[PDB]
Amino acid sequence: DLNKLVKELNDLGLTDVKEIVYNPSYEQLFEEETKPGLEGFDKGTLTTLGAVAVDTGIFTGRSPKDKYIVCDETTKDTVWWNSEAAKNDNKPMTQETWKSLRELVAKQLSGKRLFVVEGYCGASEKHRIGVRMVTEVAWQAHFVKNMFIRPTDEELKNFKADFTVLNGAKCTNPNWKEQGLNSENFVAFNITEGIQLIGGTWYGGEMKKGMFSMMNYFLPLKGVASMHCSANVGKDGDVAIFFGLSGTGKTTLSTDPKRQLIGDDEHGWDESGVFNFEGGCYAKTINLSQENEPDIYGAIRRDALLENVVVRADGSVDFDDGSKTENTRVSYPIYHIDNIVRPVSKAGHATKVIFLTADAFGVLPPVSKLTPEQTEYYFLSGFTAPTPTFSACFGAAFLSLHPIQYADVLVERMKASGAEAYLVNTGWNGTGKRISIKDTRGIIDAILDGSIEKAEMGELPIFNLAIPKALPGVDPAILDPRDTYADKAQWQVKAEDLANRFVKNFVKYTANPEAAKLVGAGPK
C-alpha cells in the first residue's frame, strides 16, 4: 500500500522520497519526537507529566494575513471573497502563484524521510472528509493524529484522501513581494485540487483550522450545517449545541456530569444528527491549574502534546509562564476526557441551540427565546463584550462562505427537528456585576429541561426579545434586565447605544441580499 502512497505523493510533486512512517502508533510517535539528534523546532522535550512538549517559533497563533484561497472556476462564484464591502481573510490567489507554491512545498518535502497520517474530519459517515497530512516533522503528524478522527485498521484499508495537507513549515517564499502576498509565509488552499499548503508557520492550529475552513465550505453547500460550537447530549438523547466567544462561559455551561460531551469546538449537523469534526482537543493552558481545570490537567499525560509551554531544567512545566506566548496550548485525543460520547463522537438532532454572550453594556436579558429570523440575525452578529466584539457566526476567521449561508442551513436543520434558539447573557446587568453562576446554570437547566417553554413571556423593547417571567430556581428580578436598574434611564441610554452598535455592525453583511432582509429582525 506504500507504493500507491509514494505514487500519489509523486503526483503531487514530491520526488526522491525516502522512508515513510505511515500512520504511526502513539508509541512510535513518542519515540520519534524524542530521538537523539533532532534539531530546531523538530525537537520534543520530555516532561515530568510524561507528555512531550514542543515549540513553534515565530508563530504562536494563526496568521490570517497569510491565508489565501485559490481563485478558479470552482471558487470564483462560491467563495466569500474579501472585499471593500466586508473585509475578511479569504484572499484570492492566482493559479500561477499556487503552482509555484505547491512546487516549492513539494521540493521542501522531497529527498527525505516523511511522516504521513490519515484521519477523518467529521464523525458523520456521509459527510466526513478524509484528510492525509504529509510532514517531515514527527510532532506535526502527532498533532493530526490527535485532532482528527483516527480510522480503524479496516477503515484505513479503504481510506480515500479527499484533502491533503502538505506541511512545509521549514520553507519560506522569497518571491512573495512580486507575487503580491502578505509575507514570506503562507497558508493556502486550493479547493479544486483538495490541497492545503503550509509554509513558514509551525503553529499547530493552522492544520486544525485549515480543515475546519474547508468543512465550512463543503458542508453548507450540501445543506449540512458547519458550526463553531460545543455540543452535548443528555441521558434521554436530547442534544444541545452551545455557541460563545471567550469569556462567555461556554466551556463551563457545556460541562455537565449528567450529559455526555459530543465535542467542544467544531460540529456538523446533517440528516442524522450532530457530529464532532474532531478526534481531540486543542486547549489553552496559560495559567492552567489542576484545581481550576481538573479535566484538562488530567488529560495532560503521554500522547498529549504541549505547545510553547516553558519547561524547566528538571522537565517540570510552568503553566503560568507566558514568556514564549500567552497562547500556550496542549492537544490530546478526545478519550483523555472521561464523560464523552463513545466510540464515535456524534448523536441525534439538536433541539436546543444556545447563543452565549457576555454583555458588558448590561442591556440584554439573562435569557431570550429567539424567532427564526432573530436566530439568524444574532448568529451573524456574534456579539460579546464596554468594548464590543462582533464575530460573524461565532467564527469569522473560518468562514469560507457568506455568514448567511451558515445561518440558513442552521435554521433549516432547527426547523426540521423542532429546535428552539436562546440568547443567554452571562454578562452584566443593572447591578454592575455579572449574573450569578447559580442563575446562569438555572437558565441553562430550564432551557435543557424545557421549563422555559412553559413560562409566560413578556417582550423587551428595542430588541423585541421574548423573555420569560419566571424560571425554576432563577431569581425572577433579573429576567427583565430593566428591573435591575434603579434608574431605568441608565438602561434606556445603554440599550439605544448597544442597539446602534448592532445596526452599524450589520451593514457590511447586508452586501449579501439574503442577509439584507434580516435588518427587520434586528434591534430598532
Ligand X SMILES: *SC[C@@H](O)[C@H](O)CS(=O)(=O)[O-]
CA distance 279 to 177: 38
Nearest distance, CB of residue 323 and ligand X, angstroms: 29
Nearest distance, CB of residue 209 and ligand X, angstroms: 22
CB 166 within 8 A of CB 144: no
* CB closer to Mn ion, 344 vs 396: 396
Please identify which of the residues 45, 74, 172, 251 carries the catalytic annotation: 251
Nearest distance, CB of residue 104 and ligand X, angstroms: 5
Cell digits of residue 292 = 481550576
Please identify which of the residues 83, 192, 246, 431 carries the catalytic annotation: 246
* CB closer to Mn ion, 45 vs 251: 251
Annotated binding-site residue? 172? no
The answer to whether 264 contacts Mn ion (rule: CB under 5 A) is no
DSSP result, 76-121 = TTTS----SSS--S-EEE-HHHHHHHHHHHHHHTSSS-EEEEEEEE
Count of C-beta atoms within a 10 Å radius of residue 93: 23
* CB closer to Mn ion, 265 vs 408: 265
Please identify which of the residues 62, 67, 494, 508 carries the catalytic annotation: 62
Nearest distance, CB of residue 169 and ligand X, angstroms: 10
CA distance 175 to 61: 24
The answer to whether 206 contacts Mn ion (rule: CB under 5 A) is no
Active site (annotated) includes residue 209: yes
Annotated binding-site residue? 66? no
Count of C-beta atoms within a 10 Å radius of residue 39: 6
Annotated binding-site residue? 430? no
Say which entry of ligand X, Mn ion, none residue 206 contacts (CB below 5 to 8 A, set by partner kind).
none
* Number of residues engaging Mn ion in binding (CB under 5 A): 1
Active site (annotated) includes residue 55: no
Q: What is the DSSP letter of 398?
A: G
Q: Cα angle at 283 between 32 and 159, to 5 degrees?
A: 55
Nearest distance, CB of residue 142 and Mn ion, angstroms: 20
Annotated binding-site residue? 250? yes
Count of C-beta atoms within a 10 Å radius of residue 375: 23
Annotated binding-site residue? 487? no
Burial class (CB in 10 A: 0-12, 13-18, 19+), 222: exposed
Nearest distance, CB of residue 112 and ligand X, angstroms: 10
Active site (annotated) includes residue 251: yes
Please identify which of the residues 132, 209, 402, 501 carries the catalytic annotation: 209
Say which entry of Mn ion, ligand X, none residue 265 contacts (CB below 5 to 8 A, set by partner kind).
Mn ion
HEC profile for 216-265?
A: HHHHHHCCCEEEECEEEEECCCCEEEEECCCCCCHHHHCCCCCEEEEECC
Q: Cα angle at 317 between 315 and 318, to 5 degrees?
A: 135
Of 69, 138, 141, 143, give the one whose Cα is nearest residue 101: 69
Query: Considering Cα of 482, then 487, then 489, then 495, what sign does the dihedral take?
Result: negative
Annotated binding-site residue? 203? yes
CB 337 within 8 A of CB 84: no
Instruction: Give residue for cell 453562576.
Output: 437
Of 498, 454, 444, 453, give the one whose Cα is nearest residue 474: 444
Which H/E stretch holds residue 156?
A: helix 153-157
* CB closer to Mn ion, 284 vs 324: 284
Active site (annotated) includes residue 62: yes
Say which entry of ligand X, Mn ion, none residue 482 contacts (CB below 5 to 8 A, set by partner kind).
none
Please identify which of the residues 127, 142, 208, 329 carries the catalytic annotation: 329
Please identify which of the residues 43, 228, 267, 494 carries the catalytic annotation: 228
Q: Choose the stretch contacting Mn ion; rule: CB under 5 A; options: 75-83, 98-106, 258-266, 402-410.
A: 258-266
End-to-end CA distance of the chain: 62
Nearest distance, CB of residue 240 and ligand X, angstroms: 46
Over its C-alpha atoms, the chain yields an Rg (Å, rounded) of 24
Please identify which of the residues 127, 128, 132, 250 carries the catalytic annotation: 250
Annotated binding-site residue? 362? no
HEC profile for 402-425?
A: CHHHHHHHHHHHHHHHCCEEEEEE
Count of C-beta atoms within a 10 Å radius of residue 153: 7
Residues that bind ligand X (CB under 6 A): 104, 107-108, 171-172
Annotated binding-site residue? 338? no
CB 499 within 8 A of CB 524: yes
Active site (annotated) includes residue 264: no
Say which entry of Mn ion, ligand X, none residue 23 contacts (CB below 5 to 8 A, set by partner kind).
none
Say which entry of ligand X, Mn ion, none residue 420 contacts (CB below 5 to 8 A, set by partner kind).
none
Active site (annotated) includes residue 345: no
Active site (annotated) includes residue 336: no
Q: Taking CB under 5 A as the criterion, which residues in 448-487 touch Mn ion?
A: none
Count of H-run helices and E-run strands, the chain:
13, 27
Nearest distance, CB of residue 280 and ligand X, angstroms: 29
The answer to whether 265 contacts Mn ion (rule: CB under 5 A) is yes
Say which entry of ligand X, Mn ion, none residue 107 contacts (CB below 5 to 8 A, set by partner kind).
ligand X
Q: Please report, in range form, the residues annotated as the binding site for Mn(2+).
A: 209, 228, 265
Q: Please report, in range form, the residues annotated as the binding site for ATP.
A: 209, 228, 244-252, 293, 329, 434-435, 440
Q: Which of the residues are catalytic? A: 62, 209, 228, 246, 250-251, 265, 329
Q: Please report, in range form, the residues annotated as the binding site.
A: 62, 203, 209, 228, 244-252, 265, 293, 329, 434-435, 440
Which residues lie near Mn ion (CB under 5 A)?
A: 265
Q: Please report, in range form, the residues annotated as the binding site for substrate.
A: 62, 203, 209, 329
